[PDB]
């Protein structure tokens, strides 16, 4: 698909069996998703945004489906605003930005 | 311009005669820039991230040239880290994400 941006670009995402929405960041290096269960061992990470640092929780070789398309690699969990999908995963089902 | 996402999205911008790099941030849905003097009236105001909220100076109808191309709209000023271009500045040189 081609998405404008006069909205949030928000998408439907799959992980876990589980429908969620997230938002499409391309100014994220990482994705990061609010609380939830994931499979496997995490480990410490610490990133930072507009407002400061967090402390994530990172899990790697995570299945999602984005907006229909699959990916697999990292997810890190912690207290964020949004679902965000960051470029970790926007290069994985082969996003690009177009001006 | 097709940018892939390998590496973080930074482009040239000129605003106030200075040129200056910034993320292009499809999740944000204002321009945020680090400090800096523009011309006219500001009020303030409070926008939330990835580690809460700061406070910024909001001065609207500011052009800005983003890679070569001129666009007028809101642009906030305070302590981010890095300078921004998000949605209201992207929807007016035609930007989108594509996959
Ligand atoms: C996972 C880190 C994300 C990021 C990284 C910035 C960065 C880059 C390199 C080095 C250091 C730091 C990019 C980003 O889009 C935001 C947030 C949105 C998630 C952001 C960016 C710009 C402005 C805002 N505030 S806002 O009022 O314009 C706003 C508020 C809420 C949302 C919502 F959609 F996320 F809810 C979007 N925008 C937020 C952020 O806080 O940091």
Redo the contacts with the bound molecule.
Sequence with gaps: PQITLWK?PLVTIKIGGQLKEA?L?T??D?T?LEEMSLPGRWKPKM?????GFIKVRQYDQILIEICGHKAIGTVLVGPT??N?I?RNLLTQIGCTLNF
Excluded: H, K, S
Excluded at 47 to 51: L, P, R, S
């Design positions: 949030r938002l960041d100014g994220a990482d990061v990133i930072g945004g507009i407002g605003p949004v965000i960051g």
